[PDB]
Amino acid sequence: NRMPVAPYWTSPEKMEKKLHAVPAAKTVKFKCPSSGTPQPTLRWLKNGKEFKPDHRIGGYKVRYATWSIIMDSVVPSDKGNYTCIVENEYGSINHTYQLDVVERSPHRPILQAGLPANKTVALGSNVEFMCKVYSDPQPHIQWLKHIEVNGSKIGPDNLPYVQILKTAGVNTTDKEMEVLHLRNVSFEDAGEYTCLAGNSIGLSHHSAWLTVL
Amino acid sequence: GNYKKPKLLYCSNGGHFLRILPDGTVDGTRDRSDQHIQLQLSAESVGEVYIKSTETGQYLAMDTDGLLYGSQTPNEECLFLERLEENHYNTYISKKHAEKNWFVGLKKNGSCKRGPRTHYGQKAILFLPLPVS
């Protein structure tokens, strides 16, 4: 009845944020405000194929009044490209959003199993110690030596006596701290060597023993 | 993924990647192919980090005005307290200006949001650590 008009974007600006990276469990909303005569329809694709609400647990909400799609409680399987298609007898336009669902590790550093491995070596030989760490918030690594001041190895607070041997700081490198290297190992260099990895959430530690002979 | 590997700091606002420009300017961008958004983070202490470009090797810093620039040599204005908030985003507050509670932030357009005008309730301070690819 009215002069035909191919679909167009009613609010381009509100569309520039192409990449949507959000932490898991959050709620994502993609909007493609458009118009045209006859009045255009709207449908969504996900990684190429049609996107029906049966494709994700709990489906999703579409509010055509706002040309939007809404997904509550994002999960890893929601990762992908989301494309809206606006179509009427006289045309088609589309926009594609990239949804990335990030999982966080709000935990203390996880230390690799095994490392640092215990040891008993021969004098004068140069011995290493590898400590490998997984941590979301940037971790900080420090190597310690289980001191034996007086006769006790356990201090007055039930915490084992130690001495800081190597600390991470600007320089070194994430990979230089990953290892504690000894020189002409002696006798007194006998004991337990501990790697301490700590982040803004907590601290984790692994030990290894080294006897001299 | 691996704290030693580079990452991109994605702002929740305009959905920008934090970018340090050779001229020492730091803004935002969606150009996930840029070479000045790749950041390497290092901790001086538990929870205290440095952020720097793996291209210009500049360190992200914030002056007494609240401006984020690319410093060639680290220093106090180069330290930030990294925090994983409860909403699961990362905030970065100036170590030097911790009290003034200045956060690292980007406006919606993708430009530095001078620490002073930054607030904890805000959305420009919220960053998501992303992989390069």
The single-letter DSSP state of residue A38 is S
Q: What's the resolution in A? A: 2.6
C-alpha–C-alpha distance, residues B76 and B61, integer Å:
8
Most distant CA pair in chain A, distance: 98
Number of separate domains in chain A: 2
Of the partner residues A19, A104, A170, the one whose CB lies closest to the CB of residue B32: A19
Chain B contacts of A140, Cβ < 8 Å? 43-48
- Start-to-end CA distance of chain B, whole Å, equals 12
Range of the domain at A8: 1-103
Residue with token string 């205290």: B48
> What DSSP letter does each residue of A45-70 carry, written as one string?
EETTEE--GGGSTT--EEEGGGTEEE
CB atoms within 10 A of CB A50: 10
- The domain boundary residue, chosen from A75, A103, A131: A103
**Whether residue A116 sits in one domain with residue A91:** no
What is the SS3 assignment for A77-95?
HHCEEEEEEEEECCEEEEE
Give Cα A13 distance to the centre of its chain: 30
B121 backbone dihedrals φ, ψ, rounded to 5°: -70, -20
C-alpha–C-alpha distance, residues A111 and A82, integer Å:
37
**Whether residue A96 sits in one domain with residue A164:** no
A177 contacts A168 by C-beta, under 8 angstroms? yes
C-alpha–C-alpha distance, residues B110 and A201, integer Å:
30
Residue with token string 């932030």: B105
> What DSSP letter does each residue of A154-178 carry, written as one string?
B-TTS-B--EEEEE--SSS-TTTTT
Give Cα A177 distance to the centre of its chain: 21
Query: Shortest CA distance to B126 belongs to which of B94, B82, B88, B89?
Result: B89
Task: Give the DSSP H/E element, type plus range, for residue B81.
Answer: strand B80-84
Length of chain B: 133
Q: Sheet harboring A140-145: ordered strands across?
A: A119-121, A203-212, A191-198, A140-145, A163-167
- Start-to-end CA distance of chain A, whole Å, equals 98
Cis peptide before A76 (omega within 30 of 0): no
Residue with token string 């040309």: A67
Query: Shortest CA distance to A81 belongs to which of A66, A61, A95?
Result: A95
**Whether residue A118 sits in one domain with residue A49:** no
- The domain boundary residue, chosen from A80, A103, A126: A103
**Whether residue A132 sits in one domain with residue A86:** no
**Whether residue A99 sits in one domain with residue A110:** no
Range of the domain at B24: 1-133
**Whether residue A179 sits in one domain with residue A152:** yes
CA separation, residue A112 to residues A21, A195, A206 (Å): 29, 11, 9
* Min Cα separation B125/chain A (Å): 14
C-alpha–C-alpha distance, residues B14 and B92, integer Å:
17
**Whether residue A26 sits in one domain with residue A116:** no
- The domain boundary residue, chosen from A64, A88, A103: A103
C-alpha–C-alpha distance, residues A107 and A24, integer Å:
16
Task: Look up the CATH number of the domain holding residue A74.
Answer: 2.60.40.10
Question: 3-state class of B120 per DSSP?
Answer: coil
**Whether residue A112 sits in one domain with residue A205:** yes
CA dihedral A44, A46, A52, A54 (to 10 degrees): -150
Q: Would you state the structure tokens that stand for residue B51, as one six-digit string?
A: 């952020």
Task: Give the DSSP H/E element, type plus range, for residue B99.
Answer: none
Question: Given an 8 Å threshold on Cβ–Cβ distance, is B49 in contact with A138?
Answer: yes
* Type of residue numbered B89: Y
B117 contacts B78 by C-beta, under 8 angstroms? no
Question: Given an 8 Å threshold on Cβ–Cβ distance, is A21 in contact with B128?
Answer: yes
Number of separate domains in chain B: 1
Chain A contacts of B4, Cβ < 8 Å? 173-175
> What DSSP letter does each residue of B4-40 carry, written as one string?
TS-BEEEESSS-PEEEE-TTSBEEEE--TT-SSS-EE
A207 backbone dihedrals φ, ψ, rounded to 5°: -120, 170
A209 backbone dihedrals φ, ψ, rounded to 5°: -105, 150
Task: Look up the CATH number of the domain holding residue B119.
Answer: 2.80.10.50
**Whether residue A203 sits in one domain with residue A128:** yes
C-alpha–C-alpha distance, residues A200 and B83, integer Å:
7
